[PDB]
């Protein structure tokens, strides 16, 4: 198996900088680039773990497109525009 490890460097230092500009901030301090990856890894633990559990129950082996909307809805963040 291709042992994946040290993959959290996908969300890179300018990419958080570009996302912050949508929110309308002006000066980013130096310590945020660690803390955002701490938050962002937490948020994807919850969605995929609910997404797998539906498509474990249907006994098929591909995460469908509807198996993200049907798990995002119960958290209280629905998502329009994906065949919903």
């Amino acid at each position: 198996r291709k042992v994946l490890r040290d993959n959290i460097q996908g969300i890179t230092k300018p990419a958080i900088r570009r996302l912050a500009r949508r929110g309308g901030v002006k000066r980013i301090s130096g310590l945020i680039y660690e803390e955002t990856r701490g938050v962002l890894k937490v948020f994807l633990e919850n969605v995929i773990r609910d997404a797998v559990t539906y498509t474990e129950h249907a006994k098929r082996k591909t995460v469908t497109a509807m198996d993200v909307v049907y798990a995002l809805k119960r958290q209280g963040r629905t998502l329009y525009g994906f065949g919903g």
Binding site: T78, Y80, G81, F82, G83, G84
Partner: peptide, 10 residues
Amino acid sequence: MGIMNSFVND
């Protein structure tokens, strides 16, 4: 249209 397809069914 997929928004309005997924807007009435919410």
